[PDB]
Design a protein around this ligand. Structure first.
Ligand SMILES: Nc1ncnc2c1ncn2[C@@H]1O[C@H](COP(=O)(O)OP(=O)(O)O)[C@@H](O)[C@H]1O
Ligand code: BEF
Ligand SMILES: [Mg+2]
Ligand SMILES: [Zn+2]
Ligand SMILES: [Zn+2]
Ligand SMILES: [Zn+2]
Lengths: 668, 291, 204
């Protein structure tokens, strides 16, 4: 009994059950629930999970406890707390906050720590649950699902500037100079007619002083839905997220996130009709937890958010911006790097379904790693992005490779030729429905900052649209000067492009340049240009057909590959760690090899320029990072040169004519 | 009344009055502040340069912390303290020849916070913000001290200082009125302050990855107006202030409100910045500037 | 009369208030949004829940607790809205359109608004050819006031039952009756060639 009216929540029972769950939670219970008995490790499953976590939380001083919903589900006695929290997030979350405060006080007191208890007493401990069920989509939320904790995930299109939120207002009777303090209750701060004390009683005695009042931070984030399942004929939707407190500025635009919050509906006011509300309520989603890091994708680049990390530390947002690396996982990384065929294994673990495109898969991996992001402290900078072009015959799996890269990369945008425009990329101006005032948004290139922008059907794209590519292509920034906006935007985006040679099929008769059909300025910027060729080879075609047919044997097939491939989670761990810790440097022998290769190359087919030298440098840097080395060696430069030679099929190309002999163009 | 405000005001007066430090190797121990009072009196200037480190060294920084954390309430107290200091020492420049509105422009603060780093907790505090000047307004007069003519018991009464919101005198030259019908301003007797609203962009180097340059509107008053150049990197020192916003009514989330007969006011605001010190980040002139 | 499906043009002002069936194509369907039927306010001073019915596109909140005590006693209770306690309903403003067969010679199709409410939401999608049966109710005029001459009424159709002319593929259940019609097709033999020749028999 004693339950809150309108809810099944009872404070005593909920507090007791949550305390029991906190004290007596073993991760082996979750592993049993998740059918992980084969994967159980009682070397760490028997220890108290949330007790140790709260000990760490006390030691560090963090004020936020990230609670997992399925953790509550697994423990039998607190199973009902799962449904109670899902249906009544507000009261239940407040109850959990109080329970965490009490249990933390008990833990500190029992261990008899010497430091004063009141110093840490005054601090609001907030619980941030997540992973509350499946996505369910968003258009399916009936109005009976108001104020229920839900799971949403999607791209972050735009974010509003921080908006102050008055919680405590300060009035002052001007004659009596008496300050006033009124709190907020459901969004209203009552105006007192008379004074709080008995000094004077007047009808209009006090005046509001806004600056004296207390303001909290609120930011509105526009998220675009990406549900797993979408009903037929439905365009992508858009829901307005609202964040508070430390979560302000946590999420940048273009971040594929997974947000948990409370569904909310609010009456809306008629235009210039004072205090008349439309019956149709407007729905928005609150925010309690944000899961930026995902194991299906690479981690966000540390270099791009390095400046924002200090501001986050100041805010203490406690959002997991970058996934942490476990020690045994680091040992596994080291042993995998110790493998002899590290290069082939990593290459083939990228897009496992694709068959016999090893040179292309390689280049993709070297792009995924990237060169050293050197910082010229005198002025200027060099970024280690590598751009790849795939001009090839039809049905060679190029679009599939682009799709896989787009899935893997943290912040990537897929684009296809005529579906793009110059203003469509970069940045533009638009009008929001809610503010009804002009704002600035981000195009595909800006949203691809710190990632890969998979540009499909390159050749079909207009010459006008391709013009803006040069700026971000060379110096990795875009500087727009248009109506109302004059600034520079850093778009450190590595462009991946797929194109069909003009004629849709490679012409052996015409040279490589004429088949590719791109201007020399744009063509030279591409570090690697892959001439994927579909040749009628009986053995290769038989093998490809056998692989594709074996893909059709069973409903949910495991991939049919002779050789073992890394898990995508482990590959993401490896790539993230290699990118963010290791920053290789060049050596004298590598320098001599680079100079010799550049000289020999520059001796019709495209003429190598200094951009070719920079591509060789960046490829050598990328290869150094792949092996986990902190320096690059001459064999890596030779490998980069070999990759450049193989991408354009230099061996099969005629030396001076530029035509390709079809007898020698055969591949594996 | 507030005891803490008056106590901090008199502590500021005392600290200014007894400010002492060695001046380099020459000039011995020079009361730089007290001497600069008459130095600026020579030209009858309107600015008093309060270097932060001076206020920070004394009282183990407690005075500086009090001023920075709650500048908005303390500022009138500091104005009264400065007037009293002028009264005690160097009273020859107080009159305009009513009284010159002396400007206390702080500078040499510890850190400069970016536009993106503006936070809702630090409003009402003192800080420095660095941005690019993109749009500037005209030098429009702003009503600071006003003269009001009472519709009833008609006369002219000045010294009804203007607040942030409109204010009119409840007391009348003829007390039998006690009515505030049509208190009318006049051009010749009201007092005004120079005003300017400058729009600033976030600097290119500090732009977050994959984000647009967030902008801000900065108010310039007094002798600091008409100092910035469009496209010139500048730093602004002052206090964060909130201004009413009529646009964010349809945004999601609950809204602040009041009840007093509905007696309800829709309460929304947007954060701006009131600035005091702004700086830009014949061959004889250039030679003179040259060391 | 409800049996006969009517084109949009035949929905005159005579049929207002009745139960009618309109046959046509669906062009625009809005998202499901919560519509207020009764809004619930909480007055903590007197501990009463007061419910204001809403029966229009707009409404107005309250300021004084209209319950017996606050209106009667000198106590003036402040009342606050409660979304969870209030009543909502899934609402969708669809828009049906006239078919090409129903349009007379030389005219162009005209549309009629449908207010789908309750559990019937998400039963209509754009491009569907349906016979929606509903109540032809009037609404107060919503256009410009100058064009108003008398108590003009805008009209809509509150949907009650939806019948799809062409059933969706994703909505197939092998119910015993569908099972029998289907196995009868199987027993016909040569289902592939019979189905192939079946489409467009007029083509040789
Ligand atoms: N070498 C290959 N390895 C794997 N799948 C391939 C290969 N070549 C063709 N395919 C398959 O054939 C189709 C062609 O891929 P797609 O990317 O659509 O072609 P395109 O290169 O013209 O864009 C895909 O379904 C792909 O899986
Ligand atoms: F025919 Be493919 F899309 F290059
Ligand atoms: Mg393709
Ligand atoms: Zn008073
Ligand atoms: Zn008067
Ligand atoms: Zn009441």
């Amino acid at each position: 009994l004693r339950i809150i009216w309108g809810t099944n929540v009872s404070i005593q029972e909920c507090t007791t059950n949550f305390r029991n769950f906190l004290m007596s939670f073993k991760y082996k219970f979750r592993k049993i629930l998740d059918e992980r008995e084969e994967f159980i490790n009682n070397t760490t499953d028997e220890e108290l999970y949330y007790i140790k976590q709260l000990n760490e939380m006390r030691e560090l001083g963090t004020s936020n406890l990230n609670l997992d919903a399925r953790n509550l589900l697994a423990y039998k006695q607190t199973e009902d707390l799962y449904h109670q929290l899902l249906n009544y997030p507000q009261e239940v979350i407040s109850i959990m906050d109080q329970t965490i405060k009490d249990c933390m006080v008990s833990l500190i007191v029992d261990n008899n720590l010497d430091y004063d208890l009141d110093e840490i007493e005054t601090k609001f401990y907030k619980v941030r649950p997540y992973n509350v069920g499946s996505c369910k989509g968003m258009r399916e939320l009936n109005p009976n699902d108001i104020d229920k904790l839900i799971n949403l995930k999607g791209l972050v299109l735009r974010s509003t500037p921080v908006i102050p939120d008055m919680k405590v207002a300060f009035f002052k009777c001007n004659v009596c100079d008496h300050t006033m303090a009124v709190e907020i209750d459901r969004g209203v701060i009552q105006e007192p007619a008379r004074c709080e004390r008995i000094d004077c009683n007047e009808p209009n005695s006090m005046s509001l002083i806004h600056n004296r009042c207390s303001f909290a931070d609120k930011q509105v984030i526009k998220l675009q839905e990406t549900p797993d399942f979408v009903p037929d004929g439905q365009t992508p939707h858009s829901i307005s997220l609202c964040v508070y407190d430390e979560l302000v500025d946590s999420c940048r635009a273009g971040d594929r996130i997974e947000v948990t919050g409370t569904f909310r509906s609010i009456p809306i006011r008629a235009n210039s009709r004072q205090r008349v509300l439309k019956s149709l309520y407007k729905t928005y989603v609150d925010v309690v937890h944000v899961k930026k890091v995902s194991d299906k994708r690479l981690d966000v680049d540390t270099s791009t958010i390095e400046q924002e990390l200090m501001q986050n530390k100041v805010d203490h947002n406690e959002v997991e911006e970058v996934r942490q690396i476990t020690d045994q996982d680091l040992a596994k990384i080291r042993e995998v790097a110790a493998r002899e065929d590290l290069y082939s294994l990593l290459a083939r673990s990228i897009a496992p379904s694709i068959y016999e495109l090893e040179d292309v898969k390689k280049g993709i991996l070297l792009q995924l790693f990237g060169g050293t992001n050197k910082t010229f402290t005198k002025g200027g900078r060099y970024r280690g992005d590598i751009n790849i072009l795939l001009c090839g015959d039809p049905s060679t799996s190029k679009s599939q490779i682009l799709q896989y890269v787009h899935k893997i990369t943290p912040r990537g945008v897929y684009t296809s030729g005529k579906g793009s425009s110059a203003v469509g990329l970069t940045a533009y101006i638009t009008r929001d429905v809610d503010t009804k005032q002009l704002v600035l948004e981000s195009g595909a290139l800006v949203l691809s900052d710190g990632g890969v922008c998979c540009i499909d059907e390159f050749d079909k794209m207009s010459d006008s649209t391709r013009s803006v590519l040069h700026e971000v292509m060379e110096q990795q920034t875009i500087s727009i000067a248009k109506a109302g906006i004059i600034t520079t935007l850093n778009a450190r985006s590595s462009i991946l492009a797929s194109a069909n040679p003009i004629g849709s099929r490679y012409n052996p008769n015409l040279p490589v340049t004429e088949n590719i059909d791109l201007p020399p300025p744009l063509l030279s910027r591409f570090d690697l240009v892959y001439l994927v060729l579909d040749k009628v080879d009986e053995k290769n075609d038989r093998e490809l057909a056998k692989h594709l047919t074996n893909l059709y044997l069973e409903d949910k097939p495991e991939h049919i590959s002779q050789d073992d491939v890394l898990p995508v989670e482990f590959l993401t761990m490896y790539i993230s760690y290699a990118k963010e810790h290791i920053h290789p440097i060049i050596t004298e022998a590598a320098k001599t090899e680079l100079v010799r290769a550049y000289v020999g190359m520059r001796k019709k087919r495209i003429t190598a320029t200094t951009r070719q030298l920079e591509s060789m440098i960046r490829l050598a840097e990328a290869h150094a990072k792949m092996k986990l080395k902190n320096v690059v060696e001459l064999e890596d430069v030779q490998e980069a040169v070999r990759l450049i030679r193989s991408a354009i099929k230099d061996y099969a190309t005629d030396p001076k004519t530029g035509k390709i002999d079809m007898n020698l163009v055969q591949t594996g | 009344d507030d005891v803490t405000g008056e106590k901090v005001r008199e502590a500021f007066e005392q600290f200014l009055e007894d400010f002492s430090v060695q001046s380099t190797d020459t000039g011995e121990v020079e009361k730089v502040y007290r001497a600069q009072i008459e130095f600026m009196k020579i030209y009858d200037l309107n600015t008093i340069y309060i270097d932060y480190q001076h206020l920070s060294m004394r009282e183990n920084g407690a005075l500086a912390m009090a001023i920075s954390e709650q500048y908005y309430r303390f500022l009138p107290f500091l104005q009264k303290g400065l007037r009293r200091v002028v009264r005690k020492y160097a009273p020859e420049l107080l009159n305009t020849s009513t009284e010159r509105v002396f400007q206390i422009s702080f500078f040499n603060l510890p850190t400069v916070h970016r536009i993106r780093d503006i936070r809702s907790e630090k409003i009402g505090s003192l800080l420095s913000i660095s941005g690019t000047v993109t749009r500037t307004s005209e030098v429009r007069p702003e009503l600071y001290k006003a003269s009001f003519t009472c519709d009833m018991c008609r006369a002219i009464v000045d010294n009804v200082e203007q607040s942030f919101k409109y204010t009119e005198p409840t007391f009348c030259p003829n007390p039998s009125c006690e009515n505030r019908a049509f208190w009318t301003l006049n051009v010749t007797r009201s007092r005004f302050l120079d005003w300017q609203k400058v729009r600033i962009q976030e600097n290119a180097n500090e732009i977050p990855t994959g984000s647009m340059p967030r902008t801000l509107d900065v108010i310039l008053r007094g002798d600091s107006v008409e100092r910035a150049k469009p496209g010139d990197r500048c730093k602004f020192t002052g206090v964060e202030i909130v201004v009413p916003d009529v646009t964010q009514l349809g945004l999601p989330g609950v809204k602040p409100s009041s009840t007093l007969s509905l007696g309800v006011r829709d309460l929304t605001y947007k954060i701006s910045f009131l600035a005091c010190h702004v700086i830009s980040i014949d061959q004889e002139v250039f030679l003179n500037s040259l060391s | 009369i409800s049996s006969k499906p009517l084109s949009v043009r035949q929905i005159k002002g005579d049929f207002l208030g009745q139960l009618i069936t309109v046959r046509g194509i669906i062009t625009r369907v809005s998202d499901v949004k919560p519509a207020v039927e009764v809004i619930a306010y909480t007055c903590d001073q007197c501990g009463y829940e007061v419910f204001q019915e809403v029966n229009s596109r707009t409404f107005t909140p309250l300021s004084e607790c209209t319950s017996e005590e606050c209106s009667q006693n000198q106590t003036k209770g402040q009342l606050f809205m409660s979304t969870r306690a209030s009543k909502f309903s899934a609402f969708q403003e669809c828009k049906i359109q006239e078919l090409s067969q129903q349009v007379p010679v030389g005219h162009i199709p005209r549309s009629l608004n449908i207010h789908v409410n309750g559990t019937l939401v998400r039963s209509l999608s754009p491009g569907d050819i349906v016979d929606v049966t509903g109540i032809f109710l009037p609404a107060p005029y919503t256009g410009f006031k100058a064009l108003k001459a008398g108590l003009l009424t805008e009209t809509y159709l509150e949907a009650q039952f939806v019948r799809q002319h062409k059933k969706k593929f994703a909505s197939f259940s092998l119910t015993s009756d569908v099972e029998e019609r289907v196995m009868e097709l199987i027993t016909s033999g040569d289902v592939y060639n019979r189905l192939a020749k079946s489409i467009a028999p007029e083509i040789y």
